[PDB]
Design an enzyme around this catalytic site. Sequence first.
Site, PDB file in Angstrom:
ATOM      1  N   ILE A  22       0.824  -1.325  -0.041  1.00 17.48           N
ATOM      2  CA  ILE A  22      -0.039  -0.032   0.086  1.00 17.48           C
ATOM      3  C   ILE A  22       0.922   1.186  -0.014  1.00 17.48           C
ATOM      4  O   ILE A  22       0.831   1.905  -0.947  1.00 17.48           O
ATOM      5  CB  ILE A  22      -1.050  -0.157   1.102  1.00 17.48           C
ATOM      6  CG1 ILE A  22      -2.054  -1.136   0.989  1.00 17.48           C
ATOM      7  CG2 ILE A  22      -1.647   1.434   1.316  1.00 17.48           C
ATOM      8  CD1 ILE A  22      -2.825  -1.104   2.347  1.00 17.48           C
ATOM      9  N   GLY A  25       5.449   4.881   5.464  1.00 18.76           N
ATOM     10  CA  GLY A  25       5.645   6.120   6.357  1.00 18.76           C
ATOM     11  C   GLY A  25       7.206   6.425   6.384  1.00 18.76           C
ATOM     12  O   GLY A  25       7.974   5.803   5.669  1.00 18.76           O
ATOM     13  N   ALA A  26       7.269   7.143   7.439  1.00 22.18           N
ATOM     14  CA  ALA A  26       8.905   7.445   7.607  1.00 22.18           C
ATOM     15  C   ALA A  26       9.324   6.134   8.482  1.00 22.18           C
ATOM     16  O   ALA A  26      10.585   5.851   8.742  1.00 22.18           O
ATOM     17  CB  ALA A  26       9.329   8.745   8.597  1.00 22.18           C
ATOM     18  N   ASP A 140       0.293  14.748  15.815  1.00 19.71           N
ATOM     19  CA  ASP A 140       0.867  14.816  14.270  1.00 19.71           C
ATOM     20  C   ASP A 140      -0.186  14.579  13.491  1.00 19.71           C
ATOM     21  O   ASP A 140      -0.177  13.886  12.528  1.00 19.71           O
ATOM     22  CB  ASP A 140       1.838  13.800  14.295  1.00 19.71           C
ATOM     23  CG  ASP A 140       2.639  13.622  13.094  1.00 19.71           C
ATOM     24  OD1 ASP A 140       3.054  14.838  12.787  1.00 19.71           O
ATOM     25  OD2 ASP A 140       2.941  12.499  12.669  1.00 19.71           O
TER      26      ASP A 140
HETATM   27  N1  LIG Z   1      -4.993   0.604   8.428  1.00 16.66           N
HETATM   28  C1  LIG Z   1      -4.619   1.094   7.320  1.00 16.66           C
HETATM   29  N2  LIG Z   1      -5.192   0.889   5.990  1.00 16.66           N
HETATM   30  C2  LIG Z   1      -4.934   1.518   4.940  1.00 16.66           C
HETATM   31  N3  LIG Z   1      -3.888   2.152   4.480  1.00 16.66           N
HETATM   32  C3  LIG Z   1      -3.189   2.338   5.910  1.00 16.66           C
HETATM   33  C4  LIG Z   1      -3.516   2.089   7.179  1.00 16.66           C
HETATM   34  N4  LIG Z   1      -2.666   2.489   7.966  1.00 16.66           N
HETATM   35  C5  LIG Z   1      -1.578   3.115   7.259  1.00 16.66           C
HETATM   36  N5  LIG Z   1      -2.000   3.334   6.114  1.00 16.66           N
HETATM   37  C6  LIG Z   1      -1.063   3.793   4.950  1.00 16.66           C
HETATM   38  O1  LIG Z   1       0.361   3.705   5.281  1.00 16.66           O
HETATM   39  C7  LIG Z   1       0.570   5.120   5.300  1.00 16.66           C
HETATM   40  C8  LIG Z   1       1.530   5.042   6.399  1.00 16.66           C
HETATM   41  O2  LIG Z   1       1.090   4.522   7.660  1.00 16.66           O
HETATM   42  P1  LIG Z   1       1.528   5.470   9.243  1.00 16.66           P
HETATM   43  O3  LIG Z   1       0.879   4.799  10.179  1.00 16.66           O
HETATM   44  O4  LIG Z   1       1.610   6.833   9.113  1.00 16.66           O
HETATM   45  O5  LIG Z   1       2.994   5.062   9.002  1.00 16.66           O
HETATM   46  P2  LIG Z   1       4.156   5.461   9.799  1.00 16.66           P
HETATM   47  O6  LIG Z   1       5.513   5.282   9.351  1.00 16.66           O
HETATM   48  O7  LIG Z   1       4.393   4.600  11.248  1.00 16.66           O
HETATM   49  N6  LIG Z   1       4.138   7.101  10.644  1.00 16.66           N
HETATM   50  P3  LIG Z   1       4.369   8.263   9.422  1.00 16.66           P
HETATM   51  O8  LIG Z   1       5.791   8.515   8.771  1.00 16.66           O
HETATM   52  O9  LIG Z   1       3.914   9.800  10.089  1.00 16.66           O
HETATM   53  O10 LIG Z   1       3.374   8.259   8.129  1.00 16.66           O
HETATM   54  C9  LIG Z   1      -0.586   5.905   5.623  1.00 16.66           C
HETATM   55  O11 LIG Z   1      -0.461   7.238   5.476  1.00 16.66           O
HETATM   56  C10 LIG Z   1      -1.608   5.186   4.774  1.00 16.66           C
HETATM   57  O12 LIG Z   1      -1.324   5.526   3.433  1.00 16.66           O
END
Ligand SMILES: Nc1ncnc2c1ncn2[C@@H]1O[C@H](COP(=O)(O)OP(=O)(O)NP(=O)(O)O)[C@@H](O)[C@H]1O
EC number: 2.7.11.24
Length: 336
Positions: A22, A25-26, A140
Amino acid sequence: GPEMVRGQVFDVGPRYTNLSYIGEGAYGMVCSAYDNVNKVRVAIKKISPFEHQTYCQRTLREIKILLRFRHENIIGINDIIRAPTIEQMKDVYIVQDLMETDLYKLLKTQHLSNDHICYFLYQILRGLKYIHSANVLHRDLKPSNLLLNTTCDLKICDFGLARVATEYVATRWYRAPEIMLNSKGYTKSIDIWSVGCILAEMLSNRPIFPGKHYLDQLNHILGILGSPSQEDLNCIINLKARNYLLSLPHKNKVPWNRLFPNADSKALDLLDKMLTFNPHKRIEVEQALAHPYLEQYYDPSDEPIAEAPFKELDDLPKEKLKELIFEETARFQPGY
Ligand SMILES: Nc1ncnc2c1ncn2[C@@H]1O[C@H](COP(=O)(O)OP(=O)(O)NP(=O)(O)O)[C@@H](O)[C@H]1O
Ligand SMILES: *[C@@H]1[C@@H](C(=O)OC(C)(C)C)C(=O)CC[C@]1(C)C(=O)OC
């Protein structure tokens, strides 16, 4: 052996199969998957935080908060996969309900009507009301962690920075000015500022306060809000930051309707109260929910709150934090 995606190990079988990338993120890489036990589609976020104290903090906070929250507009954790021994644990997989996209991706392709802006804004604030009722700050909020499904339901996610009432992030265009200035005493109003920034982006499909760094960011904010008032200046705790702002050239306030000439006036009234420099004067989540812009959706009887509030990890070394993460995830292991 283990299942693989884009050359990355995704060891979540045999229960979870049919992985499809999908996004990323960072910190986490996220796939869709099929849960063969419950016969449902899920999302799985892989994180590998144990070499970095700050990543361990993010992981522990997200797991701890999301497992205690239960709300239609907040993503839930269904399951967590990690190794059966702490020595083998290098990755953590967080299984969640599958959403279709996020607001960042949607805005890249679509210009939203006013009715859709009201609905998304209402859902944001409805989730935020529950968050803030638990005395938790998300800290955030941004378009990329506002998840959306095909039915246009909205769920907030990414609680790695959440705290009961910083660190590097991929974007700080949504951060309140006091975060860049006072560096302490953060309140629930910092989330409201972030939501104001998202509302502005939904109105124009462009970020309202972009900027390469904090200094450039503050210049963007001041170029629209104008130079801070006397009362504004007094609510800045750090005197060196206050003296910095006193050093800047004077800036007039740009009327909201020059920036958003076609926007609904009710939307701009609420935006004004959200993007208020003084955090004490900034509108609160329940007041925003009752603002006339949201009268089509406002329904306090259907806007639930947390049963009771929550009531430190910066000193803990990463080895302690890994123990804590192992402990917090034991409830998903056989034999707990
Ligand atoms: N439950 C979910 N269902 C579908 N897409 C998701 C889901 N969780 C996350 N995503 C996608 O995956 C991306 C990354 O998730 P995220 O939880 O923000 O990652 P992170 O690296 O831990 N924190 P960040 O760097 O701030 O985005 C999100 O911006 C969505 O596009
Ligand atoms: C939204 C409309 C829609 O297509 O949603 C997006 C995916 C473009 C955000 C639509 O089809 C009719 C009305 C809804 C469902 C809506 O939420 O209106 C309040």
